[PDB]
Design a protein around this motif. Structure first.
Motif, PDB file in Angstrom:
ATOM      1  N   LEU A 154      53.117 -16.712  13.427  1.00 53.23           N
ATOM      2  CA  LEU A 154      52.932 -15.647  14.657  1.00 53.23           C
ATOM      3  C   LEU A 154      52.595 -14.307  13.776  1.00 53.23           C
ATOM      4  O   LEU A 154      52.764 -14.181  12.912  1.00 53.23           O
ATOM      5  CB  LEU A 154      54.080 -15.446  15.401  1.00 53.23           C
ATOM      6  N   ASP A 155      51.871 -13.544  14.605  1.00 54.60           N
ATOM      7  CA  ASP A 155      51.238 -12.369  14.302  1.00 54.60           C
ATOM      8  C   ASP A 155      52.421 -11.212  14.184  1.00 54.60           C
ATOM      9  O   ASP A 155      52.191 -10.047  13.961  1.00 54.60           O
ATOM     10  CB  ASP A 155      49.981 -12.057  15.348  1.00 54.60           C
ATOM     11  N   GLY A 209      56.335 -11.767  10.465  1.00 49.08           N
ATOM     12  CA  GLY A 209      56.502 -10.912   9.246  1.00 49.08           C
ATOM     13  C   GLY A 209      56.154 -11.671   8.021  1.00 49.08           C
ATOM     14  O   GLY A 209      56.811 -11.483   6.784  1.00 49.08           O
ATOM     15  N   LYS A 210      55.226 -12.641   7.924  1.00 50.19           N
ATOM     16  CA  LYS A 210      54.638 -13.378   6.957  1.00 50.19           C
ATOM     17  C   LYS A 210      54.373 -12.345   5.739  1.00 50.19           C
ATOM     18  O   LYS A 210      54.370 -12.726   4.688  1.00 50.19           O
ATOM     19  CB  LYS A 210      53.553 -14.300   7.438  1.00 50.19           C
ATOM     20  N   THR A 211      53.568 -11.239   6.129  1.00 53.86           N
ATOM     21  CA  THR A 211      53.079 -10.469   5.156  1.00 53.86           C
ATOM     22  C   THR A 211      54.246  -9.582   4.543  1.00 53.86           C
ATOM     23  O   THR A 211      54.438  -9.300   3.367  1.00 53.86           O
ATOM     24  CB  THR A 211      52.308  -9.412   5.603  1.00 53.86           C
ATOM     25  N   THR A 212      55.295  -9.368   5.332  1.00 50.50           N
ATOM     26  CA  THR A 212      56.495  -8.570   4.810  1.00 50.50           C
ATOM     27  C   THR A 212      57.314  -9.354   3.607  1.00 50.50           C
ATOM     28  O   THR A 212      57.692  -8.895   2.639  1.00 50.50           O
ATOM     29  CB  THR A 212      57.495  -8.515   5.757  1.00 50.50           C
ATOM     30  N   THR A 234      53.963  -2.874   6.032  1.00 55.89           N
ATOM     31  CA  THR A 234      53.248  -3.979   6.429  1.00 55.89           C
ATOM     32  C   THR A 234      52.338  -3.673   7.768  1.00 55.89           C
ATOM     33  O   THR A 234      52.835  -2.877   8.505  1.00 55.89           O
ATOM     34  CB  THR A 234      54.066  -4.927   6.727  1.00 55.89           C
ATOM     35  N   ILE A 235      51.165  -4.194   8.020  1.00 53.05           N
ATOM     36  CA  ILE A 235      50.312  -4.295   9.051  1.00 53.05           C
ATOM     37  C   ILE A 235      49.549  -5.572   9.485  1.00 53.05           C
ATOM     38  O   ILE A 235      49.543  -6.477   8.737  1.00 53.05           O
ATOM     39  CB  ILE A 235      49.228  -3.075   8.764  1.00 53.05           C
ATOM     40  N   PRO A 236      49.038  -5.678  10.551  1.00 49.50           N
ATOM     41  CA  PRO A 236      48.562  -6.865  11.195  1.00 49.50           C
ATOM     42  C   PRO A 236      47.304  -7.290  10.389  1.00 49.50           C
ATOM     43  O   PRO A 236      46.387  -6.845  10.085  1.00 49.50           O
ATOM     44  CB  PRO A 236      47.905  -6.335  12.396  1.00 49.50           C
ATOM     45  N   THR A 237      47.518  -8.520   9.549  1.00 44.32           N
ATOM     46  CA  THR A 237      46.673  -9.108   8.508  1.00 44.32           C
ATOM     47  C   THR A 237      45.526  -9.520   9.332  1.00 44.32           C
ATOM     48  O   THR A 237      45.664 -10.707  10.173  1.00 44.32           O
ATOM     49  CB  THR A 237      47.203 -10.015   7.681  1.00 44.32           C
ATOM     50  N   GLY A 254      48.648 -14.680  11.826  1.00 41.14           N
ATOM     51  CA  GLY A 254      49.268 -15.747  12.669  1.00 41.14           C
ATOM     52  C   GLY A 254      48.516 -15.445  14.101  1.00 41.14           C
ATOM     53  O   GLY A 254      48.929 -16.407  14.870  1.00 41.14           O
ATOM     54  N   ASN A 298      62.832 -14.639  10.193  1.00 39.27           N
ATOM     55  CA  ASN A 298      62.673 -13.249   9.850  1.00 39.27           C
ATOM     56  C   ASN A 298      63.385 -12.119  10.763  1.00 39.27           C
ATOM     57  O   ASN A 298      63.858 -12.806  11.789  1.00 39.27           O
ATOM     58  CB  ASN A 298      61.016 -12.696   9.765  1.00 39.27           C
ATOM     59  N   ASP A 308      67.804  -9.239   9.265  1.00 40.51           N
ATOM     60  CA  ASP A 308      68.670  -8.138   8.943  1.00 40.51           C
ATOM     61  C   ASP A 308      68.886  -7.488  10.097  1.00 40.51           C
ATOM     62  O   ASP A 308      69.918  -6.228  10.480  1.00 40.51           O
ATOM     63  CB  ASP A 308      67.781  -7.313   7.875  1.00 40.51           C
ATOM     64  N   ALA A 352      63.255  -9.714   4.798  1.00 41.94           N
ATOM     65  CA  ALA A 352      62.403  -9.155   4.115  1.00 41.94           C
ATOM     66  C   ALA A 352      62.553  -7.795   3.845  1.00 41.94           C
ATOM     67  O   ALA A 352      62.076  -7.386   2.744  1.00 41.94           O
ATOM     68  CB  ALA A 352      60.906  -9.638   4.925  1.00 41.94           C
ATOM     69  N   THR A 353      62.981  -7.024   4.762  1.00 43.51           N
ATOM     70  CA  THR A 353      63.420  -5.612   4.541  1.00 43.51           C
ATOM     71  C   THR A 353      64.108  -5.528   3.185  1.00 43.51           C
ATOM     72  O   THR A 353      63.958  -4.479   2.595  1.00 43.51           O
ATOM     73  CB  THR A 353      64.127  -5.213   5.810  1.00 43.51           C
TER      74      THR A 353
HETATM   75  N1  LIG Z   1      63.256  -4.761   9.463  1.00 42.76           N
HETATM   76  C1  LIG Z   1      62.323  -5.479   9.246  1.00 42.76           C
HETATM   77  N2  LIG Z   1      61.143  -5.497  10.097  1.00 42.76           N
HETATM   78  C2  LIG Z   1      60.298  -6.519   9.489  1.00 42.76           C
HETATM   79  C3  LIG Z   1      60.618  -7.637   8.692  1.00 42.76           C
HETATM   80  N3  LIG Z   1      59.400  -8.468   8.543  1.00 42.76           N
HETATM   81  C4  LIG Z   1      58.545  -7.915   9.222  1.00 42.76           C
HETATM   82  N4  LIG Z   1      59.023  -6.637   9.854  1.00 42.76           N
HETATM   83  C5  LIG Z   1      58.202  -5.853  10.814  1.00 42.76           C
HETATM   84  O1  LIG Z   1      57.055  -6.600  11.245  1.00 42.76           O
HETATM   85  C6  LIG Z   1      55.954  -5.586  11.345  1.00 42.76           C
HETATM   86  C7  LIG Z   1      54.873  -6.099  10.342  1.00 42.76           C
HETATM   87  O2  LIG Z   1      55.176  -7.372  10.352  1.00 42.76           O
HETATM   88  P1  LIG Z   1      53.993  -8.439   9.441  1.00 42.76           P
HETATM   89  O3  LIG Z   1      54.545  -8.937   8.219  1.00 42.76           O
HETATM   90  O4  LIG Z   1      52.529  -7.571   9.867  1.00 42.76           O
HETATM   91  O5  LIG Z   1      54.114  -9.706  10.479  1.00 42.76           O
HETATM   92  P2  LIG Z   1      53.060 -10.864  10.446  1.00 42.76           P
HETATM   93  O6  LIG Z   1      53.744 -12.433  10.429  1.00 42.76           O
HETATM   94  O7  LIG Z   1      52.372 -10.886   8.941  1.00 42.76           O
HETATM   95  O8  LIG Z   1      52.078 -10.779  11.453  1.00 42.76           O
HETATM   96  P3  LIG Z   1      50.478 -10.480  11.345  1.00 42.76           P
HETATM   97  O9  LIG Z   1      50.404  -9.767   9.663  1.00 42.76           O
HETATM   98  O10 LIG Z   1      50.088  -9.765  12.430  1.00 42.76           O
HETATM   99  O11 LIG Z   1      49.615 -11.956  11.294  1.00 42.76           O
HETATM  100  C8  LIG Z   1      56.732  -4.289  11.157  1.00 42.76           C
HETATM  101  O12 LIG Z   1      56.990  -3.568  12.205  1.00 42.76           O
HETATM  102  C9  LIG Z   1      57.693  -4.751   9.985  1.00 42.76           C
HETATM  103  O13 LIG Z   1      58.684  -3.391  10.376  1.00 42.76           O
HETATM  104  C10 LIG Z   1      62.014  -7.720   8.029  1.00 42.76           C
HETATM  105  O14 LIG Z   1      62.386  -8.373   7.204  1.00 42.76           O
HETATM  106  N5  LIG Z   1      62.630  -6.842   8.472  1.00 42.76           N
END
Ligand SMILES: Nc1nc2c(ncn2[C@@H]2O[C@H](COP(=O)(O)OP(=O)(O)OP(=O)(O)O)[C@@H](O)[C@H]2O)c(=O)[nH]1
Ligand SMILES: *SCC1=CC(C)(C)N(O)C1(C)C
Ligand SMILES: *SCC1=CC(C)(C)N(O)C1(C)C
Ligand SMILES: *SCC1=CC(C)(C)N(O)C1(C)C
Ligand SMILES: *SCC1=CC(C)(C)N(O)C1(C)C
Ligand SMILES: *SCC1=CC(C)(C)N(O)C1(C)C
Length: 180
Positions: free
Chosen positions: A24-25, A28-31, A44-47, A69, A125, A128, A159-160
């Protein structure tokens, strides 16, 4: 000669595992990918595309590519370049609203013939978060017990901080051990 030459062929194959990170977008795959790869959480930001990450673990070279995603990115998933040995599905635990989207999205990936040979490691994800969903709920709703036709697992991750992320990479590496 047959066995020897084989042992020589693994030289450019063993000690290296291919991984993929998608879903999914908002999961938090990027995190996560950055936490396990860089050891620290960053902004992290929308990839909008894909991002490969070279990380070394237990003498192995795990390659984790993070493809968007989003729906618009869903199609791009067919450009992985055939190589990922195991996939990492990120599902938001604190986001019950979309909890079905993530489930339905993985199904599309899991129902693909072009991806019937890649793994599907699920990592809940946002664990926390004070209202983070338990493994029992995310697993049940995802039909984990009812699904025994594809290699996939559900793990609670944060991930945080990065807790539980290391264990995930260890579980996968054990499942292949080259021979598998
Ligand atoms: N607290 C917390 N926030 C998280 C975590 N993982 C992601 N986020 C939040 O998610 C947002 C960005 O997550 P992304 O890594 O962009 O999510 P994604 O799955 O990569 O979705 P896209 O990159 O848009 O395809 C931010 O607001 C982060 O704070 C986590 O483990 N903990
Ligand atoms: S895997 C590290 C990597 C390779 C290359 C593209 C040459 N860059 O220098 C980074 C650090 C992204
Ligand atoms: S891959 C296993 C590994 C190697 C070494 C650094 C010697 N440690 O003992 C661990 C378990 C991390
Ligand atoms: S999966 C398609 C492709 C990749 C590579 C490993 C380079 N193979 O040689 C082919 C051309 C089959
Ligand atoms: S998913 C690997 C693959 C695709 C397809 C052609 C549908 N086959 O089932 C194999 C296993 C070769
Ligand atoms: S993928 C699961 C796994 C691989 C192998 C080492 C061959 N074992 O059979 C287990 C079940 C540990």
């Amino acid at each position: 000669g047959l066995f020897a030459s084989k042992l020589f062929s693994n030289l450019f194959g063993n000690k290296e595992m291919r991984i993929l990170m998608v879903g999914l977008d908002g999961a938090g795959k990027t995190t996560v990918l950055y936490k396990l790869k860089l050891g620290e959480v960053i902004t992290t930001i929308p990839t909008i595309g894909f991002n490969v990450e070279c990380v070394q673990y237990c003498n192995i070279s795990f390659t984790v590519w993070d493809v968007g995603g989003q729906d618009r990115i869903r199609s791009l998933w067919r450009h992985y370049y055939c190589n990922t040995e195991g996939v990492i599905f990120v599902v938001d635990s604190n986001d019950r609203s979309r909890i079905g989207e993530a489930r339905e999205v993985m199904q599309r990936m899991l129902n693909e013939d072009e991806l019937c040979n890649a793994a599907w490691l699920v990592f809940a994800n946002k664990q926390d978060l004070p209202e983070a969903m338990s493994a029992a709920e995310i697993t049940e709703k995802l039909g984990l017990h009812s699904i025994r036709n594809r290699p996939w697992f559900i793990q609670a991750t944060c991930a945080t901080s990065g807790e539980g992320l290391y264990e995930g990479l260890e579980w996968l590496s054990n499942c292949l051990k080259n021979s598998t």
